[PDB]
Amino acid sequence: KKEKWGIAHIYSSFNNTIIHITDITGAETISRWSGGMVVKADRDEPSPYAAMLAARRAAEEALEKGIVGVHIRVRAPGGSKSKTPGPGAQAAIRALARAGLKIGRVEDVTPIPHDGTRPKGGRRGRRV
Amino acid sequence: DKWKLKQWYIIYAPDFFGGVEVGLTPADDPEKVLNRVVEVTLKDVTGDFTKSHVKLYFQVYDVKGQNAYTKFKGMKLARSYIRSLVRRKTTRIDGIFNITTKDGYKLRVMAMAIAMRRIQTSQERAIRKIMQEIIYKKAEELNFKDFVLESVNGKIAAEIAKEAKKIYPLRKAEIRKIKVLEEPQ
Amino acid sequence: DEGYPAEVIEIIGRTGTTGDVTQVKVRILEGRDKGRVIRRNVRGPVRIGDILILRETEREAREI
Amino acid sequence: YVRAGGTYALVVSREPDKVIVQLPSGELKAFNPMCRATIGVVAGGGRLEKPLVKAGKAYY
RNA sequence: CACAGGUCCCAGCUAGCCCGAAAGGGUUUGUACUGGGGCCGACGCCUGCCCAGUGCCGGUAUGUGAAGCCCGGGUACAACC
RNA sequence: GGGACCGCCAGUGGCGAAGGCGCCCGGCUGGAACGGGUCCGACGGUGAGGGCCGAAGGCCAGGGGAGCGAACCGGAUUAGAUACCCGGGUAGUCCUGGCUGUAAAGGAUGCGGGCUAGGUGUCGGGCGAGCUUCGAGCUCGCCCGGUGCCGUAGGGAAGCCGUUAAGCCCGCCGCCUGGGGAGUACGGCCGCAAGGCUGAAACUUAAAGGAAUUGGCGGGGGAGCACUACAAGGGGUGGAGCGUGCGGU
């Protein structure tokens, strides 16, 4: 068939967003970009704007490297942490769409525990 | 710049799955692509749109000059599909089974049954025993490749539903997961 | 890219800390996404049929 | 190595070039694969549970 | 003074510590529940703050830092700079 | 490679005297409901003393220690922060054998028996009827036993309870006699310790305490309104001399 398809792993949280493009197997990295080096203040890294910028940069790198199609994999921290993706997940996906990348299957691979470890914060939780 | 040093290899699916190309992988040496795992769907492997929720894992085992052939490793149903299948006011029966195929493959099979309404623990136990019996009989009757094909196809689940209708009607029956533990020797 | 014109075709309501921003729905008049209907925020007095020059047509405003 | 009463070592990994073993002190040491060892634990463990009590006991 | 008990430090073996000029040797027919080195000193309740000073340990980018080596001068060769 | 925990299904759901008890098969074992023209024949209820179990935490000894995290150490906020927030972290949380016997261990309601309108969900069993893909399947009604809600007579200060009584009766034990002092002092018993059980006086006080009503508040919620509120704007005051009115001398 001769089409180079990859996988875009999106790590979305309430503090930062990471976009990482890799080959079909996932063992070879193509482009890794996040909001930390795109924005300046720590409060704007998880912003959808920073998500769009980082996803766009990763898309340009992948296109120059010779990637046309990609399968999305959204991921929240999961485990004992939050189970909900951050604001910069759909923004990153649509930025990848805008940059000129074909999008195949879209899935959430957040690690869900089957009554695993104890979450942080104590029994009373955070009281701010 | 290290990227130019990389050259692409073509992934080939297992022969019993049609042996069709599934993707391209970049690597420097043929050794670095020996045990790479690629996740595909039965829809892409064969063509049927219905089985879009079934996922197959193919693991490389040999390289023949830009042609990396793979072998079956496991199968898992989609998380969204499982979530849709499971619902409140219904009973979910799960069966974990370690089985040996006729040829000698060691497999772990994870089967699921969804009932129309809440049922008693005794009924769930009876359904679990029925699933165990059918799975064991199929394991001792079939070989590895045809057993895996049967599991991916909705035939073993069909037999599970047909036999478990005696205890209680079933909303659905599935072989939700399969893992290849040890290869035969 | 010198902006893109979009025509206001429906008003949702007011919004903001002091109720200054009006949410509206706009159809893109020219560009790569010509004719697409999006929801965008607007500052100032706005009617139906007004033409707004949007720098980009990527993001969509959140619902009320 | 590991000859005192009540001591043992844990075989962690087996490689063609070295075998890793965790010793009583908590160190992971690499041994040649052909080194000989005996399975089990050394008898006589737990001595330090009982105090000596007497200066004469210490003397002997 | 010692003592049983407490606690700290070095050491995975050709180790740690020690005698000697060397060869060789003590701990060692030993192997961390062990060998060696300090302080307090049954038992009961407890042992708070301080690493700027001295000491010990780890790093040492950077400055200094002996001989040797290299370069230029000097010596028909060296000394010497 | 390791050590905890068994996600959704999960329910006013189910089992246990209570504390408590959720992955899956096999073995052992306790109790209860239902259906019995079955067996004994008052063998029953409650129980001062006494015995057994008993969350978390803590202790003794031996193991383990993944994640959390008292003490502690650092970073922040603050006038201060020995805290709330953030980064690490020992005991502990876990297993084996024992001690401790303490909880808002609360249905804040002790246990057995008889009686006093109904209605409506759900769990187990039994009976009858209708469907059924004949399923240990589905639907309806009735009896018994659990588990919720509304509710009539009646009860209560009221909140509310009302056949699961907090209603009228027949029994037994335990506990209370204004708020503090005070679960303190002394004495005794138990426990390795921490602690547990038992438990007063002098003196002081007019109230403490419960239910409910109206209002006033909340850095509670929801509707509204205001250029002596804001949002968008015009002009200013606050800085200088002076007019005038205050405070002070």
Angle, vertex CA A36, rays to CA A32 and CA A39, nearest 5: 120
Give the whole-angstrom CA distance, residue B101 versus residue B149. 13
> Contact A126/A120 with Cβ under 8 angstroms?
no
User: DSSP labels for chain D?
Assistant: ---STT---EEEEE-SS-EEEE-TTS-EEEE-TT-----S--SSTTGGGS----HHHHH-
CB spacing of B26 vs A107 below 8 angstroms: no
Six-digit token string for A67:
């990637």
Per-residue flag: D22 CB under 7 A of strand E: no
For A9, list phi and psi in degrees, rounded to 5: -85, 125
Checking B141-149 for CB contacts under 8 A at 24+ apart, the result is B141/B102, B142/B101, B142/B102, B143/B101, B143/B102, B143/B103, B144/B101, B144/B102, B144/B103, B144/B105, B144/B107, B144/B184, B145/B14, B145/B16, B145/B72, B147/B101, B147/B107, B148/B16, B148/B72, B148/B75, B148/B178, B149/B16
Give the whole-angstrom CA distance, residue B23 versus residue B7. 14
- Nearest-CA distance A118 → chain C (Å): 35
CB spacing of B36 vs A1 below 8 angstroms: no
Q: Which residues of C touch A94 (CB under 8 A)?
A: 58
CB spacing of A107 vs B78 below 8 angstroms: yes
Give the whole-angstrom CA distance, residue A20 versus residue A70. 11
Query: What is the amino acid identity at position C2?
Result: E
Closest CA to B40 of B75, B84, B81, B9: B75
CA distances from A123 to A113, A115, A119, B92 (A): 19, 16, 9, 31
Q: Where are the alpha helices (DSSP H) in chain A?
A: 48-65, 90-99
Pairing of strands B170-182, B106-115: antiparallel
Return the C-alpha torsion angle B120, B124, B127, B131, nearest 10. Answer: 180
Give the whole-angstrom CA distance, residue A85 versus residue A80. 14
Closest CA to B35 of B69, B60, B12, B56: B60
The dihedral sign for the CA sequence C42, C45, C49, C50: negative
> Contact B28/B4 with Cβ under 8 angstroms?
no
Give the whole-angstrom CA distance, residue A113 versus residue A123. 19
For B43, list phi and psi in degrees, rounded to 5: -60, -45
Q: What is the largest CA-CA distance in chain C?
A: 35
Experimental method: cryo-EM
How far is C-alpha D48 from the geometric centre of its chain's CA atoms?
A: 15
Checking D22-31 for CB contacts under 8 A at 24+ apart, the result is D29/D1
Six-digit token string for A88:
């910069």
Interatomic separation, CA of residue B94 and C1' of nucleotide F242, rounded (Å): 96
Please give the resolution of this entry in Å, rounded to 1 decimal. 2.7
CB spacing of A24 vs B8 below 8 angstroms: no
Query: What is the amino acid identity at position A20?
Result: H
Continuous segment of H or E residues that includes residue C26: strand C21-28
Establish how many alpha carbons lie within 13 A of residue B115's alpha carbon, considering only the half-sphere containing its beta carbon.
23
Closest CA to A59 of A7, A100, A119, A104: A100
CA distances from A48 to A100, A104, C57 (A): 19, 22, 15
Q: Which residues of C touch A91 (CB under 8 A)?
A: 59
Helices (H) and strands (E) in chain A, counts: 2, 5
Stated length of chain A: 128
Closest CA to A94 of A67, A119, A74: A74
Give the whole-angstrom CA distance, residue B9 versus residue B30. 9
Strand residues in chain A grouped as ranges (E): 5-12, 17-22, 29-34, 69-75, 102-108
Give the whole-angstrom CA distance, residue A107 versus residue B76. 14
Q: Which residue has tokens 């100032």? A: C44
Give the whole-angstrom CA distance, residue D8 versus residue D40. 7
Contact residues for B21 (Cβ-Cβ < 8 A; gap 6+): A1, B10, B11, B12, B13
Give the whole-angstrom CA distance, residue B67 versus residue B19. 11
Rounded to a whole number of angstroms, the distance between the first and last alpha carbons of chain B is 44
Stated length of chain D: 60
> Contact A22/A4 with Cβ under 8 angstroms?
no
Six-digit token string for B45:
């492997």
> What is the Cα Rg of chain C in Å?
11
Six-digit token string for B6:
């990389």
Closest CA to B35 of A8, A20, A25: A25
Q: Which residues of C touch A52 (CB under 8 A)?
A: 58-59
HEC secondary structure over B66-130: CEEEEEEEEEEECHHHHHHHCCCCCCEEEEEEEEECCCCCEEEEEEEEEECCCCCHHHHHHHHHH
> Contact A118/A80 with Cβ under 8 angstroms?
yes
> What is the Cα Rg of chain D in Å?
16
> Strand, coil or helix: what is A47?
coil
> Contact A33/A54 with Cβ under 8 angstroms?
yes
